[PDB]
Every structure is written in C-alpha cells, then in structure tokens.
Design a protein around this ligand. Structure first.
Ligand code: NA
Lengths: 217, 218, 218
C-alpha cells in the first residue's frame, strides 16, 4: 500500500585477503589496503547510503560502486541484484566490520517507499544527518555534512526535485540525470540538517502529487 | 498481426512553472526558458517525433530527451515507460500549447508497426515531411526539410537501412548505432519528401523480409 | 545442473553482397570490404569468441560487435538476443565462409557453464590458444597470442578475477568493469597458453565457491 516500505535485501558477501597487485592497480587502492569486501543487493541507492554509513563505523573506503541495467526486477542471475559495492581496508577485520555495518543499515528500516495502492510508484527521500567519506566525496562536500538523498522515476524526480529546491535552503551537489542504470533519477542536495529534512518532505510530497495526478496538467 | 499499428501511450505529463535556477543550470537552459513541460511515454522514437512537431507551432525547445534501458516492457514503475522528454518555453501557457501538440501527434496514428503475427518484431518507418527545431538540429539539416525516421531491432535495422539507402536518393544524417538504450537501432536519412517516403517503404519491406526468414541462408 | 553447458543459440544471420557507400562509412569498412555478414545470438561473449575464430578461418574482419542492455532474457523483440556482430569481407564468399566458421564455433561445445543446481549462476572460462584479429585488438596484443576469456556476474567476477590473477603468470589486458551491458563482468588476460588455461581453471573454481556459499561468512 501507499507509504509501505520496500525492504531491501543483501544477496551476496565475500572478503578478499591480500588483493593481487594487478587488481589493486585497476581499483586504484591505497597502498596498505590489502583486503576487499564485496557486496551485492537488490536496491542500489539504499546500498550506497549503507556503504557510506560503513565508512563511519570502520576503517574502510568505498572503492567501487555501480548499478545494474534495468534494476533488480530484471536481473538474469541469482546474485546480481541491482548494485555491487566494494569496500577496501587494511585487513579482513576492518572489512568485516564495514560489511557488517553495511548489512545492518540495509536492514535498519531505511528504503524506498510506495506511493500508491499497487506499489507501482516508489521513491527514496532519505535525510543523511552525517555523511561518511563516500557520499561526501560523491557530492563534493566536507565529510560529516548533511545531505538529502532524493531518488524517483524520471518524471516524478524532475518534478519533485524542483519542489525540493524551492521549499528549502539547499543546493544541488550531484544530479542523477534520467536514466540511471535502473531507470531512476534524483539528486544529492546539501545544507543544514533541518533544510535537508524539509527538502525530503517536499520531494516526497511532490512525488505523491504526481502519483495522484499523473496526466492532469 | 503483421502491419498492425503498435499504439503509443502517454504515461505522465507535468508543467513546471518558474524552474529553479539550479535545475536550469544542470539542464543547461537558456535565460529565457522559464517553464518546463515534462512527458513520459511507452515509445521513445514516436515521442521524439512528437516533441519535434511541437516546436513548429509553439515557442518551445526540446532541452532533454533520453530513452530508458531495456525499453517499456522492462520498466519497473508505472510512469517510467521508455522515454522522458522536456520542453522549455517562456511561460507555462506556451509550454501547455506545445504539450497539447505533442499529445495530439502521439494520438494521430503514428507509431511502430508489427512485422509478424505475434508482434514480436516491430519497426518505425516514419516520413517526417517537415522537421522542427529538434530533429533538424540532431540531423544537421535546416528546419523545414524532410527526414526518414527509421528504427528497428539491431540486425533488421542494419539490413533494412542498407536496403533503404540503395532504394532512394537519401543521405545518412544521424546513425543510431546498435544498441540504443531500448536495444533498437536505425538512422535519420534526409532528402526530398518523395525520396524519404521511398526510403521508408524500402526499410519497412526489408524488416518484414528478415522476419519471414531470420536465419538467412541456413 | 551444476557444470552443465549453457547452450548458446544463434537467432538471425544475414549477408549483404554489396554494401552501399553510406553504410560502408558509418561502419568503418576497409576499401576492399565489399560484403557484410550480420549475426545475432543470445550469448554475447561466446559470439565474440566465435567472430574472432572466423577472422582466422576466412578473409574477414570484425567491424562491429556490441551487447544488448540487460541481456537476452530481457529482449523485447524476437531477434535482438543480447549481441550483434558484423563481419566484413572482400566478397560474399569470404563473408559466407566467415559466418559458417562463426556458427560452427558457437555450436562446438564452448559456452557458459552453470555454477549451481538451478542454473541461476553461470560463468565463462574460455582459453583462446591463438587469438584472431578481433580479440587481439580488443586486448592490445598481437594476433596469435593467447588469452583467458573470463566472465561472470559482478561479485563472482571480481572475486574470481582476483583469484585468477594470483594463480597464474598473466597480465590484465582488458577489464570488463561491472556492469557490462548484460550485467556481467570479467576481463581478458594474456600470457602463455598454459598460464591462460591455469587462470581459466582458477576463475571457474572461484565462481563455484561463491555459488555454493553466496553470503560468505554470514
Ligand atoms: Na524483464
């Protein structure tokens, strides 16, 4: 139903000890990050927020993060989902903590929200109180700064982004131009915490107004 | 069935009045673009032709037009379809006029055509008699000249484009190298309106022949 | 079943005896290239290896080869599959022989292998003893040099690729960063023939290790 959470699921996890030099060269790892933590899930933007959360609780960096074409509902293999993330750390112990932190956040109640009765429209309006090292880098903001993580299908996102930018004292940091690999869109907006929360509410309200009137104009 | 029109559908339409300055920045709008018209549909190339049609009778420009990965049949949400287009204009009233023309054109009988009984192969063979400001820009021609808008699945398109180029006095203006986001392909060919129509007929004929014998010499 | 070959299927094949000058340019054919051979299939990496084999058995070059977004399981039309390849040759006889070699290789037993009982995870671990003109150029090595052609889903590929690089005296030539158009990943590794084979076996074993315990320490 409307306002129901779409629960994200982690599909696969694996840890690498002593990465090969060739692979470290490709992934441009820091010299003393000898261990990697791999993870896939069925929801990309939640996983991106979870990976950033992991950099806050463990001595890890996000070195790879990409979404799959057409989303998790169209995956052709068991573990592909719609996202792959790679954490790098000095040893499997740090990587293990990061992966555990990632999984806990994915299971913490955060996620996309359904906008109508048949769950055919959904959106992501997440206020990140304190960014880690990954979303702050992606957004070009100081680590620890707040951001609103806003994602929705193409038209809803463009309409709702305009509403969010006008409703709150926020600035655009990164634009997810439609289509992402999953055929969504959105942005990362920064500002004070209260402003990011106001933007999340305006974004969510705007997406709902499209779902209750998709063609009326 | 063969020769059936695949009816295109508009999924969502919205007008943004007084677009925020940072949105105008990311979208690279011009200082006189004050209102936006958003549209999604379940058929991308038909919508691109309609948006271009809108630029002839109204003061709107096509500022954004992108297709969705794997097409409308693989959309995960109700309104994503397989295309998003954005018109920019001086006021919401002018944008409304442009969108009205876009909707009328999408409902005018244009669309993809089926090449076989189960509609598992389809193609687009549209003669654009008089281009607007969008397709003319994309093709590198002057506004008001004609185009043949030819789209089909990868192999059919490469074969049928070759048939069209031999059959009519046209030149290649824009090549949609396989795959597009929707896993189709094609091109924009220009010439006289009769040459463009001859190219459309030859393109449609070639796609149908491939559908009747996909494994060629086997 | 685990270790079962995934049978690849060719979906369409077509020859063009004499390509028009316009298609010849946009497809970047050599002046002596007069004919084209088109092919689509439901498995891209097997088809790429087959096209490369064709450049060894016939006087043909691979001039176009691309994968479809989201793979063959998500194709919207009958013949799109997940790959289109184009061979070019001096006459229809060379193109025909090239296509025959391509088809013979696709049906030769090479292919993706299932990693678990329900065939929900599969991988490609193919040792190319002597590359033709296509995969050699793709990897940046001389034709005739050997390659390990390793493909698997994103997480499996990264783990198994790292495993392969440790197990053999090979170097990374081309990295298929996840996701490819088909939402797979892998790389082309070069070295001695036995070294490339050692990497292939190590890659396959590592993928199977993830498939039998996807959640790892969890
Ligand atoms: Na699908």
């Amino acid at each position: 139903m409307k306002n129901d959470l779409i629960r994200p699921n982690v599909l696969s996890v694996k840890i690498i000890s002593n990465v090969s030099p060739e692979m470290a060269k490709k992934l441009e790892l820091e010299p003393h990050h000898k261990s990697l933590g791999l993870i896939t899930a069925d929801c990309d933007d939640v996983t991106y927020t979870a990976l950033d959360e992991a950099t806050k609780a463990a001595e890890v960096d996000v070195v790879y993060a990409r979404s799959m074409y057409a989303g998790a509902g169209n995956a052709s293999t068991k573990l592909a989902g719609e996202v792959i993330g790679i954490l790098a750390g000095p040893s499997p112990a740090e990587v293990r903590s990061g992966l555990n932190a990632t999984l806990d956040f994915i299971d913490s109640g955060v996620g996309f929200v359904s906008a109508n009765e048949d769950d055919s429209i959904c959106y992501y309006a997440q206020c990140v109180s304190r960014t880690g090292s990954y979303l702050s880098k992606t957004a070009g903001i100081r680590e620890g700064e707040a951001l609103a993580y806003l994602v929705a299908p193409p038209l809803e996102a463009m309409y709702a982004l305009d509403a969010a930018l006008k409703a709150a004292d926020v600035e655009m940091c990164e634009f997810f131009a439609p289509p992402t690999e999953t055929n969504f869109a959105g942005a990362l907006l920064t500002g004070s915490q209260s402003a990011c929360k106001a933007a999340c509410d305006a974004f969510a309200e705007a997406v709902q107004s499209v779902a209750s009137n998709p063609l009326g104009f």
